[PDB]
Design a protein around this motif. Sequence first.
Motif, PDB file in Angstrom:
ATOM      1  N   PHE A  29      32.850   9.650 -49.384  1.00 59.26           N
ATOM      2  CA  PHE A  29      33.280   7.853 -50.385  1.00 59.26           C
ATOM      3  C   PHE A  29      34.355   8.612 -50.687  1.00 59.26           C
ATOM      4  O   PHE A  29      35.446   7.714 -51.392  1.00 59.26           O
ATOM      5  CB  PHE A  29      32.357   7.985 -50.932  1.00 59.26           C
ATOM      6  N   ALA A  33      36.095   5.804 -49.068  1.00 60.65           N
ATOM      7  CA  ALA A  33      35.287   4.505 -49.570  1.00 60.65           C
ATOM      8  C   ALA A  33      36.166   4.589 -50.471  1.00 60.65           C
ATOM      9  O   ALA A  33      35.262   4.463 -51.811  1.00 60.65           O
ATOM     10  CB  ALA A  33      33.759   4.911 -48.983  1.00 60.65           C
ATOM     11  N   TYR A  37      36.540   1.552 -48.389  1.00 61.85           N
ATOM     12  CA  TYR A  37      35.016  -0.074 -48.017  1.00 61.85           C
ATOM     13  C   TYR A  37      35.380  -1.337 -47.978  1.00 61.85           C
ATOM     14  O   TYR A  37      34.790  -2.295 -47.687  1.00 61.85           O
ATOM     15  CB  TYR A  37      33.602   0.368 -48.348  1.00 61.85           C
ATOM     16  N   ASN A  44      37.838   1.294 -42.961  1.00 65.53           N
ATOM     17  CA  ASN A  44      37.476   2.363 -43.474  1.00 65.53           C
ATOM     18  C   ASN A  44      37.027   3.812 -42.562  1.00 65.53           C
ATOM     19  O   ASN A  44      36.069   4.617 -43.042  1.00 65.53           O
ATOM     20  CB  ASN A  44      35.939   1.904 -44.214  1.00 65.53           C
TER      21      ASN A  44
END
Length: 54
Positions: A29, A33, A37, A44
């Motif tokens: 992430f 992210a 996101y 993303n």
Amino acid sequence: AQPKCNPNLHYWTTQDEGAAIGAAWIPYFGPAAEGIYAEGLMHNQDGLICGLRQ
């Protein structure tokens, strides 16, 4: 030039913007992210890229 096989990478100039690396065991992430996101459309992405052609 590339063989047109990249995913999106429309948020980052071009360089591996989360192309499996995270540069901090955070490719999960991280630049994929880390607030990215929020894109909620495609930003993303990861950034596979063949590298030249394969």
